[PDB]
A and B are shown apart, each in its own frame.
Chain A
Amino acid sequence: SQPVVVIDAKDHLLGRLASTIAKQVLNGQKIVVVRAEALNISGEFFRNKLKYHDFLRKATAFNKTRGPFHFRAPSRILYKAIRGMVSHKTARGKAALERLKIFEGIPPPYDKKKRVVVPQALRVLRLKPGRKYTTLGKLSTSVGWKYEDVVAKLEDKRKVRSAEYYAKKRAFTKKVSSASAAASESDVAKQLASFGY
């Protein structure tokens, strides 16, 4: 019900993200996916690697610039997975995929805005405990992404810049709860509790 939905993508499954996203973005909801380098995908590492080395093999023969553009980064792997699920050869898919802005890591504009999670694509709930999964950062870097160890230097600085804010707000709200609970024994609260508040 929001104008824009900022989907974090840690511990998520690729093709099960892309099937909720491909529908919610065709229905009009602007969806920006973020931290797509920490995506997760079923199967083993070598298996999900051969399923890409049998995709770098599929290039046009006479001029390889006309053929399948093998994108190596996770933000484009996921975009390819969504473009398969969307009829991008029309002015409906072309207009849907402009409602989607994907990045690697969290940039500043979506740093301060609240992220969400899609539970019907989470590795945690879907994958059986014990199986093998693969990290899309490891995969993209094994197939030639040059920009992983930079995102590591940006994201930790994001994290220390956000955790201190979290502690600041903890040490502002712990006493808001005191100001409420230490003043919630009048009729104004004894009557709200009978209504369910």
Chain B
Amino acid sequence: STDSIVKASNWRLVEVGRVVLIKKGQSAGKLAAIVEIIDQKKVLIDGPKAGVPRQAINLGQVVLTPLTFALPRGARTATVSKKWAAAAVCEKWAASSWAKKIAQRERRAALTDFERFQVMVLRKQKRYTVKKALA
């Protein structure tokens, strides 16, 4: 008969191979990848390319990321760094709006006052054309 409309969610789910991003830690902000699972609350990870050591960490301190790649259960630092370069994970990550807005915030914070004045100047020119055009 007619198709059955159904949808609950498509979560980003912890698994052997998922990328994560740390929000609170000694190396927060830097990417990482999951190796395997300990229990419901904590896992072990290693981001070798970003300089993350091989840790065991809970899941409150991290944020699961949509992008994912493949690796076997119980992997090691070298294998992880290998597949990390294989899957173009860093470039898949820098291409999304999340990393764009992170770098946006971090460049807005790094503005000298001359640049904060430049932006006040520049925004007056674009909105002038936009008000000339929406009229």
> Is A167 an interface position by the 8 A CB rule?
no
Q: How far is the CB of A57 from chain B (nearest CB, A)?
A: 44
> Is A180 an interface position by the 8 A CB rule?
yes
A-B contact count (CB 8 A): 42
- Given A195-B111, A195-B119, A196-B111, does the pair A184, B104 have CB atoms closer than 8 Å? no
Is the Cβ of A175 less than 8 Å from the Cβ of B134? Answer: yes
Is the Cβ of A179 less than 8 Å from the Cβ of B104? Answer: no
Task: Give bound CA distance, A129 to B122, whole Å.
Answer: 48
> Is A189 an interface position by the 8 A CB rule?
yes
Q: How far is the CB of A161 from chain B (nearest CB, A)?
A: 26
Cβ 8 A contact of A183, one of B108, B115, B129: B129
| Interface positions of A from 159 to 197, Cβ below 8 Å from B | 175-176, 179-180, 183-184, 186, 188-189, 191-192, 194-197
Is the Cβ of B105 less than 8 Å from the Cβ of A189? Answer: no
Is the Cβ of A188 less than 8 Å from the Cβ of B133? Answer: no
Chain A: residues with Cβ within 8 Å of the partner, total of 15
Chain A residues whose CB sits within 8 angstroms of the CB of B107 once the complex forms: 194-196
Q: 16 more A-B contacts (CB under 8 A) besides A180-B126, A196-B105?
A: A179-B133, A183-B126, A183-B130, A184-B126, A188-B126, A188-B129, A191-B118, A191-B122, A192-B126, A195-B119, A196-B103, A196-B104, A196-B107, A196-B111, A197-B119, A197-B122
- Name A's B-contacting residues (CB within 8 A): 175-176, 179-180, 183-184, 186, 188-189, 191-192, 194-197
10 contacts between A and B (CB under 8 A): A176-B134, A183-B129, A184-B126, A191-B118, A192-B126, A195-B107, A195-B111, A195-B119, A196-B111, A197-B108
- Name B's A-contacting residues (CB within 8 A): 103-105, 107-108, 111, 115, 118-119, 122-123, 125-126, 129-130, 133-134
